[model samples]
Target: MTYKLILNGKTHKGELTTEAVDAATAEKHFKQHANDLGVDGEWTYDDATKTFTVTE
Candidate 1:
């Protein structure tokens, strides 16, 4: 339902809190950050662990 941005292996945002975000928006954020990292690939979100990860 919510996610915090990860930058340089650290949390970019303080905490996600109760903000609700959809998959489309989440994907967009992932791509945006990935671009900053110069990484072009796919990403996956595990709602169970509430964690987001990128893969080649």
Candidate 2:
């Protein structure tokens, strides 16, 4: 399945099959950008719904 990562009000797209990986990796990847942007953000996943949201 595909996951969407949101940062700085923009959407960065990614894909992961596992729930844990999807959530963790998205957050980790977003953090890299966060450091570059000098901002803080969060990553969340809903297994029941298979959705991800990132906010900064």
Candidate 3:
């Protein structure tokens, strides 16, 4: 499934997908490559929505 990446309450313009599904996985996935995506901050994941949110 694809995970939605959010920064400042808006969707990021990067393609994010995963084979494994979970909140932890989603969060880790984003953190692992956030720099390449041009995003960095406190990140949180919601398993229900499969979304990763970044905040300053």
**lDDT tens digits by residue: candidate 1, 1-56:** 67644333332332232234776676576666667666654456767655566544
Q: 1-56, model 2: which lDDT tens digit per residue?
A: 44444443344333333323565665566566556665555666675665555555
How far out, in Å, is residue 42 in model 2?
Answer: 5.5
Give the residue spans of candidate 2 off by over 4 A: 8-21, 41-56
Q: Which stretches of candidate 3 lie over 4 Å from their true place?
A: 9-15
- lDDT per residue as tens, model 3, 1-56: 66776665244544466545766666677776676666656777777888776775
Question: Model 1, which residues run further than 4 Å from truth?
Answer: 4-20
Give the alpha-carbon lDDT of every model.
0.53, 0.51, 0.65
Q: How far out, in Å, is residue 3 in model 2? A: 2.6
Ten contiguous residues minimizing lDDT sum, candidate 2: 11-20
Better of 1 and 3 by TM-score: 3
The TM-score values for the models, in the order shown, are 0.49, 0.40, 0.53
| Candidate 2: residue pairs that collide | none
Pairs with backbone N, CA or C atoms under 3 Å apart (clashes), candidate 1: none
**RMSD in angstroms between candidate 1 and the native structure over all alpha carbons:** 5.2
Better of 1 and 2 by TM-score: 1
